[PDB]
A paper describes a structure:
SAA1.1 is an acute phase protein that becomes strongly upregulated during inflammation. Chronic inflammatory conditions, such as tuberculosis, leprosy and rheumatoid arthritis, are risk factors for the development of systemic AA amyloidosis. We report three cryo-EM structures of SAA1.1-derived amyloid fibrils: one that was extracted from the diseased murine tissue and two that were formed from murine SAA1.1 protein in vitro. In vitro and ex vivo fibrils possess parallel cross-β sheets but differ in their overall topologies and fibril protein folds.
In vitro formed fibrils are also polymorphic and contain one major fibril morphology (morphology i). This fibril corresponds to 75% of the fibrils present in solution and is considerably thinner than the other analyzed fibril morphology, termed here morphology ii. Cryo-EM reconstructions achieved spatial resolutions of 2.73 Å for morphology i and 2.95 Å for morphology ii. Morphology i is polar and presents a pseudo 21-screw symmetry. A single PF consists of two structurally equal stacks of fibril proteins that are arranged such that residues Gly1 and Phe2 from one stack interact with residues Asp22-Lys24 in the other stack. The Gly1 α-amino group is in the vicinity of the Asp22 side chain, while Phe2 inserts into a small pocket formed by Asp22-Lys24 main chain and side chain atoms. The PF encloses a large internal cavity that appears water filled as it is lined with polar (Thr21) and charged (Gly1, Asp22) amino acid residues. The ordered core of the in vitro fibrils is considerably smaller and formed by residues 1-37. The in vitro fibril contains seven β-strands (β1 to β7) at residues Phe2-Ile6, Glu8-Gln11, Asp15-Met16, Arg18-Thr21, Met23-Lys24, Ala26-Asp30, and Asp32-His36. Residues 1–37 form two partially overlapping arches (Gly1-Thr21 and Gly12-His36), reminiscent of the ex vivo fibril.
Author numbering:
A (entry chain A), B (entry chain C), C (entry chain E), D (entry chain G), E (entry chain I), F (entry chain K), ...: 1 to 37
The structure:
């Protein structure tokens, strides 16, 4: 894949550029994400 | 794939540029996402 | 695929540029998303 | 595919540019999405 | 496919530019979407 | 296909630019959509 | 697309089931094909 | 796409089931193909 | 894509099930193919 | 992609199940292929 | 990608299941392939 | 990727299950391959 980003990126809560690869018989659990202003 | 982004990107809560690949017999669970202003 | 974006992108709660690929015997669960203003 | 976007994009709750590809014997579940103003 | 968009796009709750491709023996479930103003 | 859009697009609840392609033995379910003003 | 072939297919010289997809700013050149009997 | 082939396929010289995908600023050159009997 | 082949496939000289994907600023050159009987 | 092959496959000279992926500023050269009987 | 092969595969000279991936500023050269019977 | 092979595979001269990955500023050269019977 190809991606070109120019400028600003904002994230309050969470993940950025996560790459999970080549898994077998795996499990996981992600929590909740909250944003308050 | 090809993507070109110029400018600003805003996310309050969640994931950006997530890439899950090559999985077998996998499982997972993502939580809830909240935004308040 | 090809995509060209120029300007601003806003997301209160959720995912952006998610790419799930090459899965076998997989499962998952995404939560709810809330926006309040 | 080809897409050209110029200007602003707004999303209160949900996903943007989701790409699910090459799946076999897969399952998942997405939650509800709420918008309040 | 080819698409050219110039201007503003607004979504209260839901998905934008979703691309599901190359699936076999798959299943999923999307939730409800609410808009209040 | 070819599409040219100039101006504004508004959606209260639902999907925009959804592209489902190359499916075999698939199933899914979409929820209800509500708009209140 | 959908195709169902039952029987024999013969080709002396050339390509079969060629699929070129999603190209931008591309070029190529194919040669000549000869058949003698 | 969908294809179902039952029987025999013969090729003297060339390619079968070629799939070129997602290219940008690419170039190539294929040679000649000869068949003699 | 989907393909189902049942039976025999013969190739004297060349490629089978070639898959070139996700290229940028690439070049190559293929040679000639000869068949004699 | 999906492919199902049942039976025999014969190749005198060349490649089978070649997969080139994710290349940038690349070059190469393939030779000639000969078949004699 | 997904592939299912049942039966026999014969190659006189060349490569099988070649996978080149994630290259930048690369070059190479493959030789000729001969088959005699 | 996913591959399932059941049966026999024959190669006279060449490579099988070659996997080249994550290269930068690389070069190489492969020789010729001959088959005689």
């Amino acid at each position: 894949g190809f991606f070109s980003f120019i400028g600003e990126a904002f994230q309050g809560a969470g993940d950025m550029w996560r790459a999970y690869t080549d898994m077998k018989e795996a499990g996981w659990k992600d929590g909740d994400k909250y944003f308050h202003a």
